[PDB]
Write a protein that holds these residues in place. Sequence first.
Motif, PDB file in Angstrom:
ATOM      1  N   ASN A  74       0.731  -1.296   0.028  1.00 30.77           N
ATOM      2  CA  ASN A  74       0.038  -0.002  -0.074  1.00 30.77           C
ATOM      3  C   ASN A  74       0.865   1.273  -0.031  1.00 30.77           C
ATOM      4  O   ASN A  74       0.849   2.091   0.860  1.00 30.77           O
ATOM      5  CB  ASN A  74      -1.030   0.034   1.309  1.00 30.77           C
ATOM      6  CG  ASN A  74      -1.942   1.119   1.353  1.00 30.77           C
ATOM      7  OD1 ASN A  74      -2.084   1.969   0.359  1.00 30.77           O
ATOM      8  ND2 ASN A  74      -2.461   1.455   2.468  1.00 30.77           N
ATOM      9  N   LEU A  75       1.598   1.421  -1.053  1.00 29.67           N
ATOM     10  CA  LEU A  75       2.719   2.545  -1.350  1.00 29.67           C
ATOM     11  C   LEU A  75       1.950   3.896  -1.169  1.00 29.67           C
ATOM     12  O   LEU A  75       2.629   4.943  -0.946  1.00 29.67           O
ATOM     13  CB  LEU A  75       3.552   2.196  -2.382  1.00 29.67           C
ATOM     14  CG  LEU A  75       4.508   0.936  -2.152  1.00 29.67           C
ATOM     15  CD1 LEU A  75       5.418   0.732  -3.445  1.00 29.67           C
ATOM     16  CD2 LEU A  75       5.467   1.009  -0.833  1.00 29.67           C
ATOM     17  N   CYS A  76       0.721   4.133  -1.753  1.00 28.92           N
ATOM     18  CA  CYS A  76       0.188   5.393  -1.672  1.00 28.92           C
ATOM     19  C   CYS A  76      -0.552   5.429  -0.404  1.00 28.92           C
ATOM     20  O   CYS A  76      -1.070   6.692  -0.265  1.00 28.92           O
ATOM     21  CB  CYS A  76      -0.564   5.529  -2.827  1.00 28.92           C
ATOM     22  SG  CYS A  76       0.351   5.505  -4.357  1.00 28.92           S
ATOM     23  N   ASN A  77      -0.444   4.652   0.534  1.00 31.14           N
ATOM     24  CA  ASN A  77      -1.163   4.804   1.637  1.00 31.14           C
ATOM     25  C   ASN A  77      -2.637   5.203   1.708  1.00 31.14           C
ATOM     26  O   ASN A  77      -3.100   6.217   2.490  1.00 31.14           O
ATOM     27  CB  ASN A  77      -0.327   5.782   2.688  1.00 31.14           C
ATOM     28  CG  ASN A  77      -0.593   5.794   4.302  1.00 31.14           C
ATOM     29  OD1 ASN A  77      -0.612   6.875   4.804  1.00 31.14           O
ATOM     30  ND2 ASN A  77      -0.969   4.490   4.829  1.00 31.14           N
ATOM     31  N   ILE A  78      -3.494   4.646   1.163  1.00 30.33           N
ATOM     32  CA  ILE A  78      -4.783   4.809   1.024  1.00 30.33           C
ATOM     33  C   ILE A  78      -5.762   3.721   0.565  1.00 30.33           C
ATOM     34  O   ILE A  78      -4.947   2.599   0.049  1.00 30.33           O
ATOM     35  CB  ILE A  78      -5.159   5.641  -0.472  1.00 30.33           C
ATOM     36  CG1 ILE A  78      -4.360   4.997  -1.594  1.00 30.33           C
ATOM     37  CG2 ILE A  78      -4.899   7.126  -0.397  1.00 30.33           C
ATOM     38  CD1 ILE A  78      -4.709   5.489  -3.040  1.00 30.33           C
ATOM     39  N   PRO A  79      -7.007   3.678   0.986  1.00 26.40           N
ATOM     40  CA  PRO A  79      -7.900   2.328   0.593  1.00 26.40           C
ATOM     41  C   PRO A  79      -8.230   2.549  -0.895  1.00 26.40           C
ATOM     42  O   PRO A  79      -8.425   3.674  -1.431  1.00 26.40           O
ATOM     43  CB  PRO A  79      -9.168   2.752   1.433  1.00 26.40           C
ATOM     44  CG  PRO A  79      -8.969   4.261   1.656  1.00 26.40           C
ATOM     45  CD  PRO A  79      -7.685   4.735   1.830  1.00 26.40           C
ATOM     46  N   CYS A  80      -8.154   1.348  -1.603  1.00 28.04           N
ATOM     47  CA  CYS A  80      -8.187   1.525  -2.826  1.00 28.04           C
ATOM     48  C   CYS A  80      -9.534   2.060  -3.288  1.00 28.04           C
ATOM     49  O   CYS A  80     -10.043   2.828  -4.373  1.00 28.04           O
ATOM     50  CB  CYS A  80      -8.101   0.109  -3.284  1.00 28.04           C
ATOM     51  SG  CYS A  80      -6.641  -1.007  -3.336  1.00 28.04           S
ATOM     52  N   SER A  81     -10.692   1.854  -2.361  1.00 30.29           N
ATOM     53  CA  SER A  81     -11.956   2.675  -2.659  1.00 30.29           C
ATOM     54  C   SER A  81     -11.806   4.234  -2.929  1.00 30.29           C
ATOM     55  O   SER A  81     -12.489   4.524  -3.605  1.00 30.29           O
ATOM     56  CB  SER A  81     -12.847   2.398  -1.529  1.00 30.29           C
ATOM     57  OG  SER A  81     -12.434   2.843  -0.272  1.00 30.29           O
TER      58      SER A  81
END
Length: 129
Positions: A74-81
Motif C-alpha cells: 500500500n505504497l500510496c497509503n490509501i484504501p483502494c476505494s
Amino acid sequence: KVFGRCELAAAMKRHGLDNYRGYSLGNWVCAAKFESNFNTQATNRNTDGSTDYGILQINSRWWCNDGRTPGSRNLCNIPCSALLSSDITASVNCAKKIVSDGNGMNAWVAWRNRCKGTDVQAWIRGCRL
Ligand SMILES: [Cl-]
C-alpha cells in the motif's frame, strides 16, 4: 463519475499533471481513456488476484489497500476505494508517485500499448485549458 474528455483534462491540469515528470497532459488523458473510459468507478481484476481501481486503474498489488490482496503493499497509503471517488485527488497523487518510480508512464500497460508514440495531443484538442 464519468468525465468528459476536456473536463478531465482540466481537472488533471488543475491537479498539476500537465508535464509532470515530462508527460504532457494528452498522455494522461489518453491513459485514462484506455484504462477506464474516463469512469472513476472502473474496477478490473488481474490474473494474480490483485485489482485495478479508478480512472487510472491503480493496482492493489503495490499501491493501495483493498483488504483482499495477500502479500501486497500500500505504497500510496490509501484504501483502494478512494481511487473510485468523483474527486480525483487520490488518483492523481498516487499516479504522481507511480510515474516517479523509475519506469515513467510505462507502468500503465495501456499507455505503452495505445498512447506511447501516438499523437497524444489530440486528446486535449479543442479544450479550454
Ligand atoms: Cl520518464
